[PDB]
Amino acid sequence: SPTINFINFNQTGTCISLGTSKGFKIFNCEPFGKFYSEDSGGYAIVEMLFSTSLLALVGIGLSAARLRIINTKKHSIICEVTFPTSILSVKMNKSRLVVLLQEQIYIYDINTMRLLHTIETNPNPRGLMAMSPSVANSYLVYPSPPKVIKNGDVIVFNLETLQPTMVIEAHKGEIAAMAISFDGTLMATASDKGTIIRVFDIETGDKIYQFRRGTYATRIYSISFSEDSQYLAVTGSSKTVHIFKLGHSRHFASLKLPVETNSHVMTISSIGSPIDIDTSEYPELHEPVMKMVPIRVVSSDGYLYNFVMDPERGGDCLILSQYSILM
Amino acid sequence: SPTINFINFNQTGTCISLGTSKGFKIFNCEPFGKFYSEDSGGYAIVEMLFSTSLLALVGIGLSAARLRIINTKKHSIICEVTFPTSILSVKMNKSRLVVLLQEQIYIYDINTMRLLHTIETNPNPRGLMAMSPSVANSYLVYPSPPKKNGDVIVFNLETLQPTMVIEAHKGEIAAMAISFDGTLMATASDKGTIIRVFDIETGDKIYQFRRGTYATRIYSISFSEDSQYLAVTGSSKTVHIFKLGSRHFASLKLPVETNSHVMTISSIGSPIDIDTSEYPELFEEPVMKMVPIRVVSSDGYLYNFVMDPERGGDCLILSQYSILM
Amino acid sequence: SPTINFINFNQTGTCISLGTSKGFKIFNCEPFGKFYSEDSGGYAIVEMLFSTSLLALVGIGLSAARLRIINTKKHSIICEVTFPTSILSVKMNKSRLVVLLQEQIYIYDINTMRLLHTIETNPNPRGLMAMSPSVANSYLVYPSPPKKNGDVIVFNLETLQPTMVIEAHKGEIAAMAISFDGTLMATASDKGTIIRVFDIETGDKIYQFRRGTYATRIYSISFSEDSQYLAVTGSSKTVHIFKLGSRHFASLKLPVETNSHVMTISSIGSPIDIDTSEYPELFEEPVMKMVPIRVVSSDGYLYNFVMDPERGGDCLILSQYSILM
Amino acid sequence: SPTINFINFNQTGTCISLGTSKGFKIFNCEPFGKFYSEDSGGYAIVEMLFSTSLLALVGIGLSAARLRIINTKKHSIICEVTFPTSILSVKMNKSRLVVLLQEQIYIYDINTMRLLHTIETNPNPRGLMAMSPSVANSYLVYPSPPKIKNGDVIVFNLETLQPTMVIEAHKGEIAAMAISFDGTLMATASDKGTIIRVFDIETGDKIYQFRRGTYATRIYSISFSEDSQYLAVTGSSKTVHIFKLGHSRHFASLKLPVETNSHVMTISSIGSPIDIDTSEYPELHEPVMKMVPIRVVSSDGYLYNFVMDPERGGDCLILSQYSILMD
């Protein structure tokens, strides 16, 4: 079992990208399967578009600075670009491509692949961004800390016109995680203490909802919206995943992984559209079928966990099944 | 407690073959006991014939490519054979020995050890094959993906020629098994919701079963000795039973306290009599006919369940013994 | 007159490929003439595509194992590939290149020249196959004798996977052919009395024809372009015609003065019009439509017969041209 | 095309044995096919029983002296017998095994394989023999030249291992001899091949006398039909004559195609009458009439099929032609 260095969903949440120390793999979610794989080398960044057989591959250090775009269906190379320093994050929509270094942001047109803009920002060792995947509201947000209280300043940048729109005074402390909804309407931010989750409306700039997370301060790994912006998912070092309902404070529903799971695991999640599930097979505790929101939680140890949430009841969520990635 | 790497029944379901990173062990089912053990090294595949003191040893990486056949009664080594790639699966009957690799299938005569035929197949990353254990209808079935996804090649080991090709499923095949008499074949798709049972002689689809209301992958399928029941184990920690006389006939619910990071297989035995007086709390006619079901998981526990042949339903657990100890 | 070693039509029946003990020749059918010739050496297998200046060269023993692909217009060699055993047969379509050995079948991409797949088959000492020349329905068939005698494996060249197995005949297979569109299949046993036509899509027996009242082995089978007629050639110095619309439709009787130590192949072409004025002495309307039939024999003579699509019966002979001269 | 050194039918005429310079082959007649083959080396004598998977192989020199008997179904060796001199002929029935050297005849029991008898005969450079294949009338006949009394033949009974009578067959040396299937008759011919005589082995009286050809020419082999109706002689004239024993001049004659090389050994056999379709074959009409089939194989490696009209006789039509080498 080789070590894995990178996991993320696609922009719709129906696929899996993964990077090992020996290669990368691509999975699927509902009819689970292994679409692609190569045992080329160490990969640190494997990001995919809305299917479409387009990938961004960054070597473990193929150096960490180099970025390679590969079409998996054609097994060809669209392009190859180098950077002076190691790449920290890569994100895409169907219009723009963004590469972030520790102090620089590069924006590329996805089609022509020519460089469009460059932003000189204050250092971001954590490689934090958030990209709206829709071209109607294509926005990029990146933190702007003072260069050495106003440490949690974030810059709202419009990719369409390549000009910033506004500056949001998000938090007092440094930003730890950022997420933009599918339509590019909302943005959610998390401080380094992970106690307060704040979501802002990107066009107006007003803070709409504020969530309290857990009991004591602890690190936050990632944030992600639902497809319909109904729920927000956060995962932290407490080995617990919280769901906040944006249909409008305290977390709406909580995901407790099995006890045998290691505590030192990076956990990312995703929320899918509600589906029909049979209550005859699963004693939820009864009509034969009821809609339950499926949640997929893949951890850095290499396992996938499927949960269901009742939108009215909420509460602690039942776990249906567990696969094992890399097997 | 060393980690285990291989767990499997024998061709009759009356034994447990288990190989650890330190050695291998051979158990029994009804009179539970430790028949044999050796602390030699890491073993990846330990396959046994119908008792008869015959074993096949595959090293964890003894390499994974190398295959060794030993006799436990005489403590001797029959032969050793190497392969260009890692060994993925091995199955045996009283006439033929077959070794499956990533893209090749090797067929051996179990008596002489001479090579008989080699099949060039499209890649099988899951190491999937199924063998009829009876020499009367000695068949081999393996999937044929395109290089039309669930094509299964019914290969006749008796004359070393394929017999027919069945379009089993539209998607990838996940698990295949052949009955004890070699008459029927069962397969499950990669989405693990529909079970299809084929007549290996003609290829007609006979039975179709529903299972796995949500996305729970199917791992293993097994027939009973009389082929009356079909057992499917998935990743949902629940085992379904289908009757070959649609909806499942009976279900197995492992206790919740068990480790969830486990791989579970199962096998159904011939009906036996159980004593009520031995079990005062649960299951309380001094003796009743109940079909025994044995489920072993990778965490090292053997579970015994019993089902009422008429009522079915959720099955009780009589016992839970501890392998590796 | 150096002895010839190989005779074959092209995939359409409008050309002649012939190989001598001294070189190879390429003829034509309707305007009979010598298209090409080379005095290089002995050639045992000369196969041509649909014109396109592409040839397959196999040495007599260039050895029998080596295969050379040459372009006659550019006078250059595309590639040369060797094989462990002697080459038994070669067939082509516009997308795939197939080389058959005694126990193996090699499949190549006719464009990239890269090896695609290799099939392990039971020994075929006669070098038998049949290949569909149309890329749309590119199917390959080859016999599968036991190591159940007339089993032929239907192999899909497009996806490189077998599709189905048909129990063609109870005895050993003697000759096979596939129509131009790759839809139908024809087989003949070693008895030479029964001709069976199969549908590749389903596998059903479509037609059954009677032939060869005595022991005359069948040598070659060929479909017409429109698949209206099927011609079989044997060792009896007679060629029968069957209509795919029981008893044979028409028959060809070679002249008695010809050599008897001959192997004749045939290929039925598209119907054409013949001039009656050119032939006053035989067959006496100025012109009438007549289906041409071309029979070339190993003695070095090409024959042209014509059959009336309504009357059938014995076919008149128009011309007898001398190949190799 | 390898050089072939030996061709013989089985005792029933339904099979073909053959030996090349590289190995031996076994064919069949009605459903023609290659039952067996073996690429060992030069084989000089290949004799077979009534099918039953029993063969006798004599190497060209496996020296010419050595005799090896093999079961082809089991691919095993029964026994090997060595002799001081080269073997000239071997014939079998389901009871006895006979080995001829130039001056010695050895008789073995086919079952227990123990030696039974040995006859010291005057030299036979041509290795001539005729052996009855039926155990009810197991007889052996061999020539007895002096050391005018040249064509004397010794009638030897294999059952009791004693000579029965001496036949004063011909004035000159005997050239060929054969016995009917039931062991009742015997036919011999002198080295001139002008007179064919038939003697009854029971009494010794000459029954039939046939004239063959006009000028003295060599004779290769003589063979009866299975029903003892006809007798077949083959010679250097590239022509095969058939004499009707239902009772002088040959009843019907077989002419090979003119292309055939004239320096070819030819052995023939007559089969049981069967039905043929006159609709397909313009015999020049009832749809079917019974035609007696004759199979003629030549040393060049070809087989010829003729048909004989028992009433009309005359020159026989030829239906088909194969190749025994290659296929």
Side-chain angles (χ1 to χ4, degrees):
Chain A
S1 296
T3 183
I4 58 176
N5 298 322
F6 185 86
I7 305 174
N8 56 356
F9 287 75
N10 67 353
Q11 289 74 16
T12 51
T14 65
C15 301
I16 302 293
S17 296
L18 186 142
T20 66
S21 179
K22 63 91 176 179
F24 70 97
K25 300 178 179 69
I26 294 181
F27 293 75
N28 189 215
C29 288
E30 198 277 330
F32 181 86
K34 191 176 186 182
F35 286 167
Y36 195 63
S37 179
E38 293 179 353
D39 299 7
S40 306
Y43 287 100
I45 299 165
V46 173
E47 174 85 20
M48 65 179 288
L49 192 57
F50 305 82
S51 301
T52 56
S53 180
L54 193 63
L55 299 180
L57 266 54
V58 176
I60 198 54
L62 285 171
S63 81
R66 178 181 291 176
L67 166 81
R68 181 182 295 174
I69 288 282
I70 295 174
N71 187 338
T72 178
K73 168 146 79 149
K74 302 291 181 67
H75 293 58
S76 77
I77 300 190
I78 294 91
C79 67
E80 183 178 1
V81 294
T82 195
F83 297 87
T85 68
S86 86
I87 305 166
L88 267 57
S89 172
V90 171
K91 285 189 169 68
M92 301 155 178
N93 53 11
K94 56 175 66 181
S95 177
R96 294 287 191 268
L97 184 150
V98 175
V99 174
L100 182 141
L101 314 178
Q102 54 293 310
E103 306 179 344
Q104 298 154 329
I105 286 165
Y106 289 72
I107 299 168
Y108 287 72
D109 195 336
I110 191 62
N111 304 118
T112 70
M113 185 63 72
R114 66 177 290 268
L115 193 149
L116 304 178
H117 196 260
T118 294
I119 304 169
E120 295 281 328
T121 186
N122 289 319
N124 275 321
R126 252 173 283 173
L128 297 172
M129 293 183 286
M131 171 96 88
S132 162
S134 54
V135 293
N137 297 301
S138 178
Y139 288 120
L140 172 64
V141 294
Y142 63 97
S144 191
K147 186 174 180 179
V148 64
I149 309 171
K150 304 326 303 172
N151 285 113
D153 281 350
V154 69
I155 296 311
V156 177
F157 189 90
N158 193 333
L159 290 151
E160 191 181 3
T161 66
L162 294 178
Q163 82 181 83
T165 300
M166 61 216 289
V167 184
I168 301 299
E169 297 177 1
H171 283 104
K172 188 185 292 163
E174 281 190 0
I175 299 300
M178 271 166 309
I180 293 174
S181 44
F182 193 75
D183 53 350
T185 295
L186 311 165
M187 171 199 46
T189 44
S191 72
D192 58 350
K193 287 168 173 50
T195 50
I196 286 161
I197 296 281
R198 282 187 185 152
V199 63
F200 308 96
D201 187 72
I202 198 163
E203 59 266 19
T204 65
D206 290 9
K207 170 184 69 157
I208 309 307
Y209 309 105
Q210 191 167 11
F211 311 114
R212 297 185 180 177
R213 177 188 162 254
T215 67
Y216 51 88
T218 189
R219 187 169 181 266
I220 288 187
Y221 298 113
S222 76
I223 318 178
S224 68
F225 283 89
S226 70
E227 293 301 317
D228 48 349
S229 296
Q230 197 73 260
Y231 312 93
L232 185 63
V234 306
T235 82
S237 83
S238 55
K239 200 175 64 64
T240 302
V241 176
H242 294 275
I243 304 299
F244 305 99
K245 169 175 265 268
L246 294 148
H248 302 285
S249 64
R250 290 284 295 169
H251 56 85
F252 181 44
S254 75
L255 312 193
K256 317 206 174 255
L257 298 197
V259 177
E260 314 86 2
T261 55
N262 196 353
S263 294
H264 301 284
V265 289
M266 331 295 307
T267 60
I268 62 169
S269 76
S270 67
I271 300 175
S273 279
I275 62 170
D276 289 330
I277 191 167
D278 207 315
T279 64
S280 85
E281 166 62 24
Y282 290 106
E284 301 295 328
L285 295 177
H286 283 82
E287 293 179 349
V289 288
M290 85 195 310
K291 289 183 177 181
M292 311 265 298
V293 187
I295 313 173
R296 299 174 183 87
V297 177
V298 294
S299 57
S300 64
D301 62 349
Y303 297 77
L304 187 153
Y305 309 74
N306 291 297
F307 295 77
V308 290
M309 181 185 338
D310 200 3
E312 304 106 358
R313 272 70 174 173
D316 195 340
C317 289
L318 188 146
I319 177 167
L320 314 163
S321 66
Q322 182 178 182
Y323 323 121
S324 178
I325 301 299
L326 284 67
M327 171 265 268
Chain B
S1 297
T3 50
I4 65 171
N5 297 321
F6 187 87
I7 190 166
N8 201 22
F9 290 88
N10 61 357
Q11 292 77 10
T12 58
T14 66
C15 296
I16 309 297
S17 178
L18 189 140
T20 68
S21 47
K22 187 223 284 201
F24 70 93
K25 299 177 178 69
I26 290 181
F27 281 56
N28 189 358
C29 290
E30 194 277 332
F32 198 108
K34 189 175 184 182
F35 283 175
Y36 193 62
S37 182
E38 288 184 354
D39 298 6
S40 306
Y43 287 101
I45 293 167
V46 177
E47 200 55 29
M48 65 179 288
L49 192 53
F50 300 82
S51 300
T52 56
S53 177
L54 188 65
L55 294 176
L57 311 183
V58 176
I60 190 77
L62 275 69
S63 178
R66 181 187 294 174
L67 167 77
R68 174 187 291 174
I69 296 91
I70 67 165
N71 185 338
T72 178
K73 183 162 186 299
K74 294 133 181 203
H75 280 89
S76 178
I77 318 174
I78 295 91
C79 67
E80 292 180 354
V81 65
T82 193
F83 298 95
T85 61
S86 298
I87 297 167
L88 268 56
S89 171
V90 167
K91 285 190 171 69
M92 262 175 225
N93 54 9
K94 286 183 176 179
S95 160
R96 290 288 194 265
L97 186 151
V98 173
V99 180
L100 188 143
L101 315 178
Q102 182 62 254
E103 306 183 344
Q104 313 184 300
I105 292 164
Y106 283 71
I107 298 165
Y108 285 73
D109 191 334
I110 195 168
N111 302 116
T112 315
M113 281 315 78
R114 68 153 165 287
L115 184 45
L116 310 180
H117 190 254
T118 290
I119 310 168
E120 297 286 329
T121 187
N122 284 322
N124 275 321
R126 249 168 283 170
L128 280 191
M129 72 185 218
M131 185 180 288
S132 162
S134 53
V135 299
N137 291 307
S138 174
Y139 286 126
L140 186 149
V141 301
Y142 65 94
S144 192
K147 185 176 181 180
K148 203 253 201 183
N149 292 113
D151 278 349
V152 183
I153 300 313
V154 179
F155 194 85
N156 197 335
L157 291 158
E158 194 177 2
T159 64
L160 293 177
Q161 74 181 79
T163 304
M164 82 165 152
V165 184
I166 301 180
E167 173 261 347
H169 288 278
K170 193 189 297 159
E172 295 270 339
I173 300 295
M176 317 159 296
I178 304 172
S179 43
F180 195 76
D181 51 350
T183 296
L184 308 167
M185 185 193 40
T187 45
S189 71
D190 192 359
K191 67 185 177 70
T193 51
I194 284 157
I195 304 294
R196 288 187 189 151
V197 175
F198 295 123
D199 178 77
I200 201 165
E201 294 300 326
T202 61
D204 297 12
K205 176 173 68 158
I206 310 307
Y207 298 107
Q208 190 165 9
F209 311 108
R210 285 187 179 175
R211 185 258 185 190
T213 61
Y214 182 76
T216 66
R217 293 189 295 115
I218 287 181
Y219 286 143
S220 178
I221 313 176
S222 292
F223 283 96
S224 70
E225 291 300 320
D226 55 346
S227 297
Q228 191 69 260
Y229 308 99
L230 189 63
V232 292
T233 75
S235 73
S236 160
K237 200 174 64 64
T238 301
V239 173
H240 290 92
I241 301 299
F242 305 104
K243 175 169 272 272
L244 276 74
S246 62
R247 303 279 68 178
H248 61 273
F249 185 46
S251 72
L252 311 192
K253 302 293 288 183
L254 295 176
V256 54
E257 278 65 35
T258 61
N259 190 359
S260 296
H261 304 281
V262 298
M263 281 215 88
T264 63
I265 66 173
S266 75
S267 67
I268 306 173
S270 64
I272 60 175
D273 275 331
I274 62 170
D275 185 74
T276 63
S277 297
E278 302 302 86
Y279 304 142
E281 291 194 357
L282 63 84
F283 182 75
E284 193 83 62
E285 296 84 2
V287 287
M288 293 177 71
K289 297 288 288 185
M290 311 265 268
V291 186
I293 312 171
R294 298 153 220 284
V295 180
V296 293
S297 57
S298 179
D299 61 346
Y301 284 80
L302 183 150
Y303 307 73
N304 296 303
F305 296 77
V306 290
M307 51 175 318
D308 193 358
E310 303 102 359
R311 319 289 312 293
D314 198 340
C315 305
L316 280 162
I317 177 167
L318 308 176
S319 67
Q320 161 173 11
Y321 295 99
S322 178
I323 309 168
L324 293 168
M325 182 179 72
Chain C
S1 296
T3 76
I4 69 168
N5 298 322
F6 187 85
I7 60 170
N8 201 23
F9 292 89
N10 61 356
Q11 295 79 13
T12 61
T14 66
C15 295
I16 301 295
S17 67
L18 186 140
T20 63
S21 48
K22 180 262 290 180
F24 69 92
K25 293 180 174 68
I26 294 182
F27 282 64
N28 191 212
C29 290
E30 194 273 332
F32 180 78
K34 191 172 186 180
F35 276 20
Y36 196 60
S37 183
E38 282 293 327
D39 303 6
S40 305
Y43 289 104
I45 294 166
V46 174
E47 283 291 330
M48 65 179 288
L49 197 41
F50 302 86
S51 300
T52 56
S53 176
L54 188 65
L55 292 178
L57 300 183
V58 176
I60 186 165
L62 266 184
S63 83
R66 304 191 31 181
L67 164 77
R68 177 185 292 174
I69 294 297
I70 194 167
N71 188 339
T72 177
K73 287 183 174 67
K74 278 76 176 175
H75 302 56
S76 77
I77 55 168
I78 294 90
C79 66
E80 291 182 353
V81 293
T82 194
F83 294 91
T85 72
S86 296
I87 295 167
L88 267 51
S89 174
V90 171
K91 281 190 168 69
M92 293 180 183
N93 54 9
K94 284 183 176 179
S95 160
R96 296 291 194 270
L97 190 149
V98 176
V99 182
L100 186 142
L101 313 178
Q102 202 172 229
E103 307 182 343
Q104 297 158 330
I105 292 164
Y106 282 70
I107 299 168
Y108 289 72
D109 195 335
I110 201 167
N111 301 116
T112 74
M113 271 315 98
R114 194 181 40 91
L115 183 45
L116 315 180
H117 191 255
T118 290
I119 311 167
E120 297 287 330
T121 80
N122 283 320
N124 275 319
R126 296 162 312 297
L128 282 193
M129 65 183 73
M131 183 177 177
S132 160
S134 53
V135 173
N137 291 304
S138 176
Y139 288 120
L140 184 147
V141 299
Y142 64 94
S144 188
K147 186 175 181 180
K148 184 178 183 292
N149 290 111
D151 281 350
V152 183
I153 301 312
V154 174
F155 193 90
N156 196 334
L157 287 154
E158 194 179 3
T159 63
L160 294 177
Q161 76 183 81
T163 72
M164 61 165 318
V165 189
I166 299 100
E167 297 179 3
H169 299 305
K170 195 191 296 160
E172 182 69 26
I173 299 299
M176 294 182 286
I178 303 172
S179 42
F180 191 73
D181 48 350
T183 297
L184 306 166
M185 183 177 176
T187 47
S189 72
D190 59 347
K191 297 168 179 53
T193 49
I194 285 154
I195 303 280
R196 287 189 191 150
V197 174
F198 287 127
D199 180 77
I200 296 170
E201 294 301 325
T202 60
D204 297 13
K205 175 178 68 156
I206 311 305
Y207 307 110
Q208 191 163 8
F209 312 105
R210 287 186 182 174
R211 182 261 185 192
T213 64
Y214 203 62
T216 65
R217 292 189 294 114
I218 279 172
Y219 283 144
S220 177
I221 313 176
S222 294
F223 282 92
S224 69
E225 289 303 318
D226 55 345
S227 298
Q228 189 68 262
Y229 311 101
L230 179 82
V232 296
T233 77
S235 77
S236 176
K237 197 175 61 63
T238 306
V239 173
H240 300 93
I241 301 299
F242 308 105
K243 174 169 269 270
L244 288 85
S246 63
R247 189 200 104 83
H248 60 276
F249 190 45
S251 72
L252 311 191
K253 299 298 293 295
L254 294 179
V256 64
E257 301 301 339
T258 59
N259 192 359
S260 294
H261 303 278
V262 291
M263 276 206 274
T264 61
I265 62 173
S266 74
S267 87
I268 309 173
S270 43
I272 60 173
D273 272 298
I274 67 154
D275 187 75
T276 64
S277 296
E278 294 296 327
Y279 304 149
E281 47 189 38
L282 58 84
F283 182 75
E284 280 186 354
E285 292 85 4
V287 290
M288 64 184 73
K289 203 73 161 193
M290 281 274 208
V291 184
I293 310 174
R294 281 74 177 270
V295 176
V296 304
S297 54
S298 312
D299 65 342
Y301 281 79
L302 184 151
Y303 302 70
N304 298 304
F305 298 74
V306 288
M307 48 173 294
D308 195 4
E310 307 106 1
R311 320 290 320 291
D314 198 340
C315 307
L316 271 181
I317 177 166
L318 312 169
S319 69
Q320 163 178 11
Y321 293 152
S322 178
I323 317 165
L324 178 64
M325 182 179 72
Chain D
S1 296
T3 60
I4 65 172
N5 299 320
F6 195 87
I7 301 177
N8 259 320
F9 289 79
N10 64 357
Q11 288 75 11
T12 54
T14 64
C15 299
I16 299 295
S17 295
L18 180 136
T20 64
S21 52
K22 62 93 176 179
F24 71 95
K25 298 180 177 71
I26 290 185
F27 294 75
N28 190 213
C29 287
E30 201 279 333
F32 178 85
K34 193 174 186 181
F35 288 168
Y36 191 61
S37 179
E38 184 67 27
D39 190 0
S40 306
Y43 282 97
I45 295 166
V46 172
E47 194 49 86
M48 65 179 288
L49 192 56
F50 303 81
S51 301
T52 57
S53 179
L54 193 61
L55 298 179
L57 320 181
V58 174
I60 193 66
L62 288 153
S63 81
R66 182 180 295 174
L67 181 63
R68 179 181 293 176
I69 184 165
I70 291 175
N71 186 339
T72 181
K73 269 167 48 50
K74 297 218 195 161
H75 214 297
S76 77
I77 298 191
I78 295 91
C79 67
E80 52 268 39
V81 191
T82 192
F83 293 88
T85 73
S86 297
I87 300 168
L88 269 59
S89 168
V90 166
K91 287 187 171 68
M92 307 199 163
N93 56 9
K94 55 175 64 182
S95 177
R96 292 289 192 267
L97 191 156
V98 185
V99 181
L100 186 144
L101 318 177
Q102 70 276 17
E103 306 182 344
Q104 297 155 328
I105 290 165
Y106 290 71
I107 295 166
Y108 291 78
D109 192 332
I110 197 169
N111 302 113
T112 72
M113 186 63 72
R114 63 183 288 271
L115 183 44
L116 313 179
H117 199 259
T118 289
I119 307 171
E120 288 281 329
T121 80
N122 283 316
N124 280 324
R126 254 169 285 170
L128 290 188
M129 217 186 275
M131 183 177 177
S132 162
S134 52
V135 298
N137 293 301
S138 175
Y139 285 118
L140 170 60
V141 292
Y142 62 95
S144 191
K147 64 212 161 293
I148 307 175
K149 190 180 183 293
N150 287 113
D152 283 351
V153 180
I154 292 312
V155 175
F156 189 86
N157 191 330
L158 295 156
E159 195 175 2
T160 68
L161 293 177
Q162 79 188 82
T164 302
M165 63 182 71
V166 185
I167 301 299
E168 307 172 5
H170 285 334
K171 191 187 292 162
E173 284 187 1
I174 295 312
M177 64 184 73
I179 302 171
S180 45
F181 193 76
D182 49 348
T184 296
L185 309 166
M186 182 179 72
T188 48
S190 71
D191 62 347
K192 289 166 174 52
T194 47
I195 287 160
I196 304 278
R197 281 192 189 152
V198 171
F199 308 94
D200 211 314
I201 202 163
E202 287 296 327
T203 68
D205 293 10
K206 169 181 68 157
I207 307 309
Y208 304 109
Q209 184 166 7
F210 308 114
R211 298 182 183 176
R212 176 196 163 257
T214 65
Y215 49 86
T217 189
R218 192 168 183 266
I219 287 186
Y220 302 141
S221 313
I222 318 178
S223 67
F224 284 90
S225 70
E226 295 303 318
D227 49 346
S228 298
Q229 190 74 261
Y230 317 102
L231 183 63
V233 302
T234 63
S236 82
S237 57
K238 198 173 64 64
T239 305
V240 176
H241 299 274
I242 306 299
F243 306 100
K244 169 175 265 268
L245 297 149
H247 186 195
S248 65
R249 296 287 294 168
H250 54 264
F251 180 52
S253 72
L254 311 179
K255 314 185 142 52
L256 301 194
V258 307
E259 209 286 331
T260 59
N261 189 352
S262 295
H263 302 284
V264 296
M265 295 299 291
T266 57
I267 56 153
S268 77
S269 70
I270 299 173
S272 65
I274 58 178
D275 289 330
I276 198 167
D277 208 318
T278 63
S279 84
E280 205 280 331
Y281 285 106
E283 300 299 329
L284 62 84
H285 280 81
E286 291 177 346
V288 287
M289 71 185 168
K290 292 182 175 181
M291 281 295 78
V292 183
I294 296 91
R295 298 175 181 88
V296 178
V297 289
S298 55
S299 67
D300 62 351
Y302 293 75
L303 187 147
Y304 309 76
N305 288 295
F306 300 79
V307 288
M308 159 176 300
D309 199 5
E311 292 85 4
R312 273 53 191 278
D315 195 341
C316 293
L317 191 145
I318 186 167
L319 314 165
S320 69
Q321 178 179 183
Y322 309 160
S323 164
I324 298 314
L325 290 175
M326 65 182 179
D327 199 358

